[PDB]
Design a binder for this molecule. Sequence first.
Ligand SMILES: C/C(=C\[C@H](C)CCCCC(=O)O)[C@@H]1O[C@@H]2C=C[C@@H]1OC(=O)\C=C/C=C\C=C\[C@H]1O[C@@H]3C[C@H]1O[C@@H](/C=C/C[C@H]1O[C@H](C[C@H](O)[C@H]1C)[C@@H](O)[C@@H](O)/C=C/CC/C=C/C2)[C@@H]3C
Lengths: 50, 49, 159
Amino acid sequence: VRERMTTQDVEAITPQTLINIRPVVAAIKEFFGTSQLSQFMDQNNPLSGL
Amino acid sequence: SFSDPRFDDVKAPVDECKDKDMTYAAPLFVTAEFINNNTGEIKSQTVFM
Amino acid sequence: IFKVGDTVVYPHHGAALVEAIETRTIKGEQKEYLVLKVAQGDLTVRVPAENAEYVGVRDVVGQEGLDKVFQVLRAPHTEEPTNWSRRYKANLEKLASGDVNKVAEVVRDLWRRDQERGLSAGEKRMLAKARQILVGELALAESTDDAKAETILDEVLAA
Ligand SMILES: C/C(=C\[C@H](C)CCCCC(=O)O)[C@@H]1O[C@@H]2C=C[C@@H]1OC(=O)\C=C/C=C\C=C\[C@H]1O[C@@H]3C[C@H]1O[C@@H](/C=C/C[C@H]1O[C@H](C[C@H](O)[C@H]1C)[C@@H](O)[C@@H](O)/C=C/CC/C=C/C2)[C@@H]3C
């Protein structure tokens, strides 16, 4: 955002033209999949779920 | 700026997501706002995050 | 100048509508902060009328500019050499300039071009985008429909 802020011309931009949410959703999906802390719910019985 | 993250409903129910291998998601809506110090305007979009 | 409920063309975003003229506070004073929503970007733009002339906001030009660009087309014979990167830079700077007549002349040049030659992919992207904003300005210049303005194009474009 700060990078393209200077490269973009005035009176022609909008937050839709400024913001890339692709790295944000990539960070969310990169945490929920393929982390250490995200885990398959070990659920052979409800006590192991709990 | 950035202001007021809010949500929509879920995209799909629980077992439907579990069957179709979709993540049980919900959209993020954010009242984003851009302001120029040069002349001064608000640019109050609603960015889907 | 501007009253609530009037259509008004705001560059580069084009035509938009005023919702109110708020006098909100900064530095003690309260100025002509007109809140204005647009149709494309779906955002509300607080504009002060003290620098509406700075940003160059525009009441919608009608049949004067319409017949102006309609006088320009159907023999829009321009010379530009095969320096087509220079051509694209020139019309991109023109497109940033946001003049209705020049933008219309260049997209009718692009119509004349792809009628024979065929534009590039991003060239056609720029073509369709400028057709979109120019047609929105036209369809609120006559205060009418998008399909009406497109039929207007088809019946004037070398016609
Ligand atoms: C060593 C380790 C996990 C091992 C695979 C199992 C943990 C020890 C289980 C035990 O002996 O009691 C650590 O796991 C992570 C962080 C560091 C380590 O990463 C590590 O070094 C190893 C893996 C880190 C992330 C793995 C992600 C994915 O790999 C698969 C899918 C995703 O997560 C894994 C899920 C494992 C659940 C386990 O659950 C255990 C039983 C089984 O061993 C497993 C079913 C249950 O005892 C449960 O109560 C205990 C859960 C562990 C608590 C939090 C662990 C986070 C599954 C194997």
